[PDB]
């Protein structure tokens, strides 16, 4: 009673836009490093596009009189071929930066590029997380940390999950690559917030009096 060759337009008009989002994630990550970039989202309103950003300090990306933002809007439109002025943008601010892995790991990358030793950077990150109210943070720094023969030394503090579906909700992970004279220094972070949002971790029972 129905034709399957027509709804393929609706289905293929969702896929393309999901992909368009990922290129933006990559571009922002390569661009708004200094603005505490974290993530992105999109809303394909027919008249115009809207994009919502999550940044520690938006005023940096906002730019005096909204210049950087506007310079960006005209740019994306040419690439995705939309009429500019229909490619507007909005920015939102993260308040719990310690619960965000991306902010932490990027800060760590900065601190590392200034030559400070790993032992201080990691534990400063971890203190920052715990102050934010977290049940664990693990840091790892693999590579040619010494003369040769690269090794991984990992730092941790609290308790962490490692398996199960719950690791896709309460466990936030991220990684980066740091290019240096000796070579490449792999770094990755993971944080555990069990009381996140409103969801309740299973196998967790509370009783009454």
């Amino acid at each position: 009673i129905v034709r399957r060759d027509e709804e393929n337009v609706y289905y293929s008009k969702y896929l393309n836009d999901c992909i368009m989002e990922a290129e933006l994630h990559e571009f922002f990550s390569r661009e708004l490093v200094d603005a505490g970039y974290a993530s992105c989202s999109l809303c394909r309103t027919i008249d115009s596009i809207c994009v919502i950003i999550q940044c520690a300090e938006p005023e940096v990306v906002m730019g005096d009189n909204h210049y950087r933002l506007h310079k960006i809007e005209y740019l994306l439109a040419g690439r995705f071929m939309c009429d500019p002025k229909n490619f507007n943008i909005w920015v939102d601010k993260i308040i719990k930066r310690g619960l965000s892995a991306e902010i932490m790991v990027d800060n760590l990358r900065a601190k590392l590029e200034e030559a400070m030793p790993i032992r201080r950077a990691a534990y400063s990150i971890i203190r920052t997380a715990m102050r934010a109210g977290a049940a664990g943070c693990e840091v790892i720094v693999a590579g040619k940390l010494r003369a040769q023969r690269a090794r991984a030394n990992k730092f941790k503090e609290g308790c962490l999950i490692s398996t199960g579906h719950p690791k896709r909700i309460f466990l936030a992970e991220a990684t980066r690559h740091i290019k240096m004279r000796q070579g490449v220094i792999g770094v990755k972070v993971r944080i555990y917030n069990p009381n996140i949002r409103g969801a309740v971790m299973p196998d967790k029972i509370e009783i009454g009096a």
Binding site: E7, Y10, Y11, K13, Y14, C18, L42, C43, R44, I52
Partner: protein, 103 residues
């Protein structure tokens, strides 16, 4: 007047699609009716080798992308050109849930 309009909404996650459904049903009870049709789930499947080089046990990934689709074509003549707008802006603006309107 009467324009036989139809509402189609698409999403990849099943929790907002059902939330959007409820809002619309709530906001379209007057401007005629708006009962839903739940379509068969289009599931996209991709199988990939878990290895970038082809070494060791031949082990496979199994991704998929479920896409859920609902269709309120119940407005019909019960909505005018402007009347469709009323509700469509009164419903929540969930970040991701494609919508298209056609007569």
């Amino acid at each position: 007047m009467h324009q036989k309009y139809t509402i189609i909404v698409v999403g990849k996650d099943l929790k907002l699609v059902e939330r959007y459904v409820k809002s619309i049903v709530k906001e379209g009870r007057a401007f005629g009716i708006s009962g839903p049709c739940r379509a068969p789930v289009r599931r996209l499947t991709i199988t990939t080798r878990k290895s970038p080089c082809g070494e060791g046990t031949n082990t496979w990934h199994r991704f998929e992308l479920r896409m859920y689709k609902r269709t309120f074509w119940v407005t019909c003549g019960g909505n005018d050109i402007s009347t469709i707008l009323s509700k469509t802006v009164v419903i929540p603006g969930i970040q991701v849930t494609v919508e298209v309107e056609e007569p």
